[PDB]
Amino acid sequence: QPAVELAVFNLNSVTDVADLQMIASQVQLYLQVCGNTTLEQIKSKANITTVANIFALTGSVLDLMLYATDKKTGDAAVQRGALLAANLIGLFSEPNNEAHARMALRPMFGLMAECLYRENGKIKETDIKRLGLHLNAMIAGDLENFLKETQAKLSSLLISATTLGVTILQSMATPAAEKRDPKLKFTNWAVPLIDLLGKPSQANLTPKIQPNITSRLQQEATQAIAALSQTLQQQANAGQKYTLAWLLQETLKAIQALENTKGDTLEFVSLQADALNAPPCEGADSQSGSISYSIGAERVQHADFYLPKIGFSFIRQYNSQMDEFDQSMVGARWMMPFSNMIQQNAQGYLFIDSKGRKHQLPVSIIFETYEVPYEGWIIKPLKNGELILDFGGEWRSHFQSFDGGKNYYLVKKMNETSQEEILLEYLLLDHIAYLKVINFKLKQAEYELKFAFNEQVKIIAVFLDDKAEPLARYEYDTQGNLIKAIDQNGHTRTYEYNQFHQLTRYTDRTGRGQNIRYESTEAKAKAIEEWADDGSFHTKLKWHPRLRQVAVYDAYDVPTYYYFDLDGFTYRTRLADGRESWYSRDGKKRITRQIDFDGRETQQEYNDQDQLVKIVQPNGGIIRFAYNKQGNLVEIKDPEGSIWKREYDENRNVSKEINPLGHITQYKYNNDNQLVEVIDAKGGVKKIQYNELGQMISYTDCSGKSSTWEYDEDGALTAEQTANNKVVQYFYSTKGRDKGQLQSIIYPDGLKEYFEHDEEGRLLKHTDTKGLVTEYKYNQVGLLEQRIDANRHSVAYQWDKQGRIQKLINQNQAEYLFGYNPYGYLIREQAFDGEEKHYSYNENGRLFQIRRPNILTQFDYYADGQIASKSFTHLHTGQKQTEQFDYNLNSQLSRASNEVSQIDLYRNALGQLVREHQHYKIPELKPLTAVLHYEYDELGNLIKTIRPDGHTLNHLVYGSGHIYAIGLNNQEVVSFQRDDLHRETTRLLANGLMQTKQYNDVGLLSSQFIQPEQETQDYLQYQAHRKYHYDKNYLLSQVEDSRLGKLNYQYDPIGRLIAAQSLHKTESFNFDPAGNLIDSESVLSPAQIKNNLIKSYKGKHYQYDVQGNVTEIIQAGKNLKLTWDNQNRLIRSDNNGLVTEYGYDVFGRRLYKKTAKELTLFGWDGDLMIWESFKSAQTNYTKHYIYEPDSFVPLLQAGYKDFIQLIETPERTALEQFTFYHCDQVGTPQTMTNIRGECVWEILQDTWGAVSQIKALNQDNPFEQNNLRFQGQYYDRETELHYNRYRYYEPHSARYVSKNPIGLEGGMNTSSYVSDPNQWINPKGLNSFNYGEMFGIPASAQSGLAYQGQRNYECYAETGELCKIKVPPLFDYVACSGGGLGIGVGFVKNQWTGEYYISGSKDSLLIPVAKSVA
């Protein structure tokens, strides 16, 4: 640790002089101990002229005292001398014309010392930015020039500092104020210290540094003055480490290395006063995962019961430092709701708010109104001796004193507007008031909370009205400590204490204990240690002896240093690696600037009306806010300059919202101020109804379809009804460990799902509709340790002492290892196959490099954290591929390029993608640009898209954006009819075929029929049907297909498809526990594929590179060699000597597939490949693919016999043929029909995609050929692989030939395609989705397992705090949830993922997920 430690803060954030008071008190104590003289005695002979820099004066005086008395040697001496020189520099007057320059320099030196003194400490970019801001705040010069001139002027500065130090020392070496103004001079150096000491700082001023006892005084001062010239003269030596010259040299070196509102003034002190109170902030920067960092109090808040009808939660709050509540009737140092009160002390009146924070008040409050700072709540008296507290809102709290105005208790509360009120009835015994009954006379309901007491007058039971079963029960020890609390559900929480009311251990309702240890047994003792019973999260806290800093050591002794202000606000956090996060606050403690650990800077500006008017984003984007005379946010201007307008009703509710394109949304609210009606920009009207509790009970969409929710009197969701009158019923446990929690769900088909939870809500057992059980086990600390599926196979999790995932054991017992560096960041991942990924981080802590066995991925970032570029270097061959990205001021990807492509994205004022240029840079082909145009309706629905060759696709929408017709070149190709759920029940195709779809009770496709709208005997039109039968787990058990006959499927307990019977083919699939197909037919084959990379399957043999990519597939008579680029993308395939080359754009979208002379171009619209153009000597054609709305399911293909006509990088060709797709329940094309409705193409494919037989009327007609397969899959005849956006799928082995780019986020088995291809798709090759149940009622449960919300009354107490974190604008309000009602600001239609990686140094996702790889 450095010998000298400093608290550097922005000067604007300090309003009190408490630190100055402590420094003055320390100086006075030093004088009394050494010279035995008070400051008054030395005042007379202390006439010295210095600048009016109070911080510099106090720092210099204290440093001189320490130098004279607390002599030091070694590096500590150098550091202390450097700090003394810095303080003296900004104190001497001499050249007054340079006073401001010196005053600005001194905090500069303080900051340089703070960054550089610590071991392995270096000047970072954030430090240089802070120095520049501080310099520009006052003089508005240049950092480099100022530092250079200071370096040149350093010698004279040191001489002046030595003279000043000599003069100061020649005051106490012989036997006998609040303004930081560079233009003012201090006549006497001692006088300002005395003036400071006089003020009533309201802060403890006990000196924290004990003088040397030995009263050297004159002798020590003489030795000081003797050595001061020697120590300061050597300060100019740049060779010596930890000296001002060295600090300047290092800062200049860092500036050189890194160069390839009215600023922010900084100040520093070496001695600080103790934090007066904890901050209102409860974030991770102010308290432990709880011990408050500012004051060290151990605080636990436990809720014993909830009154939903009034939204009241009985919150018991413990505070280990609350000796004022030692006699609390709910346990020593415990606070219950409404227990807040005002007590008389020597200083005056002490008020303890509901949260437990203490605010001192003057004795004059009982005679006049008083307002507290930084909080905004006022206290005023009344002529009757009661004090009214306005905490913010319509609630007024009345306080009465029952003993000579000593203790004021809360007797009643007033809601002046709503007339709601609460009375407190107190039983007065021996002039001691004991709360007896709480009267909740509220419009919601009338509740009578009565308390039963024991012989000690301690609440042992809380009763509601006349109910016999108490809402809570409490037990106490002989010392009055609350040792057991039973909640309304019968669950128990135990508490353990030492002999001094200090909570040493407490258990949650499952018995899992949290332990606390304290520095001492005194009430004001800080908690210094906490750990879970098993030892996890063992946190040690060490408070700095001199500064308002605490070092918080995690379970591995990795320190995080927090600095807090006099009011407890954490203004600076320093990590172990040296990265620092700063908060700048103004005089009102409003966060004006935040510089995060990764260097992102956010600024916030406020006007004279205390309104947030400007936000400057890290990327430099400026958000501006404007307000009307009523203080309502009317105008929002985003970084792109687009303007959002709002208008308000009388209740300060947003009634009208105008977006930058002029589209208007209107809102109506009930007297409750709850959204009751929204009129969209197209005139559609949505209706919302609420029950008396304020819970939404009915929602009618703009199409008139109404869904309803039923709640019981208590307010628990008992049933919800869909627009098609299907009811899901919810039932809750009435007994046991999960009493009051969701126990079972009854679905409209009558099938039931059962849940079992522990007392804390953890899911322990899930029983699905088929009765199959999934069990979850949790370790001692409560983290998930084992998930046992219905197959009895288990996935085990092992966590390190900080809760980070350490080892993941899949069903095959293969281990996924996660390694973290001494700073706790993820630096190593070992996959199930043994592949090791090593992560490195740059000076900003962002993922710098991913080192895989073959490829070194390197990330470059913009200052705002967006990925500027990625490079992929082969560690052996050395070949490098790079990608570049650009973003607009809204952080939206505006350009992305790689070797073979550049994509430019253009957006309108709403952020909707309107134009997209796709520049193809294919080798051997002339560059060409494909341009997409998009148009949207007033609701943001895409209605028109112009494809690169001029062909336009039109979407006709009704209501909120439901598609009822699709037009191709203003010619309808399909029209849709939808049911009350807006699901397609009928479609009419332009080829005269109509398809009707029916759904069963749970919303699964039950049948689909296709037939001619008007039958004609001239030709055989396509008529077919599929009838779907499901099992109790909603797995497709049978299909009645008119063409294929009966298709029978069997599944394993976890829903994996293991058999398929049909007339064409019978298939049996054997999976290992991890989900790999195993060659069960061959005995020699392994029973499990431990590495999830099968080496052989049914006559096929695979070889992999070191990154898991299949490099060669060998079978009888075929040898397929696959060449992979540095991004694990197939760039060359060699099938029996036939070479095919591929290329991809930045987003992994395949742009071309070149085989000898034949070239196949592909074009994409978002995630859909919308056209393919074939080029060759003989044949040229272009095919367009039209898909069902918002889906990967193809609708039709149309094309012309010519290569696509695209713009050449710096007249529409009529479509000749139309072919209509007919897909099955999972969106897989099964047949295709021509414009006359005749079947021209049929496919029989194996269960996992392999083609078994294709029947085509016209074999050589390209427009009647189909390569589309499972959603998002494109069959490649060259390799027999299915291209799947990001990966190539291998139908034979039902797996991808490369590892999932997103790792475990896409599933435990990073090579498996889908468990059940009858209903799951995986269209992009990243994540498997259940397509069959996407439109199912079971997939719309308002309460899945714990999705319950009840916060009807947060009112009671509240303070209002924007002083804790920076405000993220995002959508601003969002408004109402549920069916979806409310928008504003933000929003990006047609979102674009830069590279889909973004991140990946993440873990601990509970449900299967490890990385942050998007």
Author numbering: 14 to 189, 204 to 287, 305 to 333, 335 to 1255, 1280 to 1483
Please, what does the article write about this entry?
The type VI secretion system (T6SS) is a molecular machine utilised by many Gram-negative bacteria to deliver antibacterial toxins into adjacent cells. Here we present the structure of Tse15, a T6SS Rhs effector from the nosocomial pathogen Acinetobacter baumannii.
We mutated the equivalent two aspartic acid residues (D1369N, D1391N) to asparagine in a single construct (Tse15NN). SDS-PAGE analysis of the purified Tse15NN showed only two protein fragments, compared to the three observed during purification of wildtype Tse15. The identity of this toxin protein fragment was confirmed by mass spectrometry peptide fingerprinting, thus confirming that wildtype Tse15 possesses aspartyl protease activity that drives self-cleavage of the toxin from the Rhs domain. Clear, connective density was observed after L1395 and the sequence of the toxin could be mapped up to residue 1484, guided by a difference map as well as the unsharpened map. Overall, the position of the Tse15NN toxin was similar but not the same as the wildtype Tse15, and lacked defined secondary structure features. We also could not find equivalent density for the helix that was present in the Rhs domain opening but did show the toxin peptide was still in close proximity to the end of the clade domain.
